[PDB]
């Protein structure tokens, strides 16, 4: 029931095209509001609110600190990038694709084809449905990209359809860990 | 392309501190404050990199000191509670008698304080459960994962109970075969 008081700081390193373009951000929060901020595109602290003006001015008076922050894109961002490059930037985990039917309403027939794509990394994924070699773009609902919190992702891409005997449905998956599209078929 | 975040916070009066490293939404490691030891999200990370926990403990002292300054300068304005959004799901499709893992995703909340309890048929579970620290978001809020490895059966139902100061009643998200 007592009041809470939170101090929260983030030091962000943003990488584009490997380490060719690197951006460094420092952010200071109290409770829910950002007050001070260092942006490598500026090279100085700036006040986000009037509450953070004393810290920005005082910090901008310390030349030794501004030089540390201005060099972070190299001494901090690019350094830490190379430390874990082998098991983060280059981490690759193949997807596990399975198809199984389901039902929109318990008392109705199987009118829902689920394409489960789980256990992959990174989060990038593209899934497509096909009826008899033609792509089905209408009637597709999905959970979206689900982060499992353990360096793996999953997603369900479902197709609302009435399967007819003889028809073949194909779930096609594209992921940076595989070269050619991955296909799984389901026959009625 | 890629983002690396170093997130640290200190909370009063709970006196809770955290220091962690993020890579595109995932945890590389966090510094255990009591043990003063670098905990890697995946054991294999420790074999490829390192980090001296003393740097984190040093930052947490500064953050603790800055909190006192900002609490005074802000005239002791308390934080506004933001209740969490809770989701329960499984690591993979569910096959009977085939091991799996229930995942409770607590999302979009502040301050970073939550009690999370796994319930099997209403009874608490305190064996086999694991949990991550508070993870950063793009919008100054926090998220958190809890895990319950289980053997799927038709006789067992599960509930993830979450309690947050921004919640009137504790949240219960359900899951069953």
């Amino acid at each position: 029931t007592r009041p809470r008081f939170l101090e929260y700081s983030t030091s962000e390193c943003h990488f584009f095209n490997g380490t060719e373009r690197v951006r460094f951000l420092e952010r200071y929060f109290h409770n829910q509001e950002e007050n001070v901020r260092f942006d490598s595109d500026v090279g100085e602290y700036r006040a986000v609110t009037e509450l953070g003006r004393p810290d920005a001015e005082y910090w901008n008076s310390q030349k030794d600190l501004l030089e540390q922050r201005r060099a972070a894109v190299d001494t901090y961002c690019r350094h830490n990038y190379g430390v874990g490059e082998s098991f983060t930037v280059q981490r690759r985990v193949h997807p596990k694709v399975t198809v199984y039917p389901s039902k929109t309403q318990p008392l109705q027939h199987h009118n829902l084809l689920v394409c489960s794509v789980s256990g992959f990394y990174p989060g990038s994924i593209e899934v497509r449905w096909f009826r008899n070699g033609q792509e089905e773009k209408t009637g597709v609902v999905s959970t979206g990209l689900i982060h499992n919190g353990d360096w793996t992702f999953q997603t369900l891409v479902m197709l609302e359809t009435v399967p007819r005997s003889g028809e073949v449905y194909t779930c096609q998956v594209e992921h940076p860990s595989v070269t050619s599209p991955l296909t799984v078929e389901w026959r009625a | 392309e890629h983002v690396i975040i170093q997130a640290e916070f200190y909370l009063n009066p709970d006196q809770s501190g955290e220091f962690m490293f993020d890579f595109d939404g995932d945890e590389i490691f966090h510094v255990d404050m009591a043990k003063k030891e670098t905990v890697w999200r995946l054991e294999e990370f420790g074999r490829f990199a390192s980090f001296e926990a003393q740097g984190a403990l040093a930052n947490i002292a500064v953050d603790k000191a800055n909190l006192e300054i900002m609490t005074k300068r802000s005239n002791y304005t308390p934080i506004t509670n933001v209740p969490p959004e809770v989701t329960v799901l499984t690591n993979s499709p569910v096959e009977l008698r085939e091991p799996n893992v229930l995942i409770c995703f607590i999302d979009k909340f502040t301050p970073p304080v939550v009690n999370v309890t796994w319930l099997r048929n209403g009874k608490p579970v305190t064996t086999g459960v694991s949990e991550t620290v508070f993870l950063p978001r793009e919008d100054h809020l926090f998220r958190k994962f809890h895990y319950l490895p289980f053997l799927p059966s038709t006789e067992d139902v599960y509930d993830c109970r979450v309690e947050h100061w921004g919640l009137d009643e504790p949240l219960l998200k359900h899951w069953e075969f």
Binding site: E26, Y58 | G55, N59, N66
Partner: peptide, 12 residues
Amino acid sequence: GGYRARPAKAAT
């Protein structure tokens, strides 16, 4: 291979 912490700066 060793990670580096940014250092926290004391506020006014």
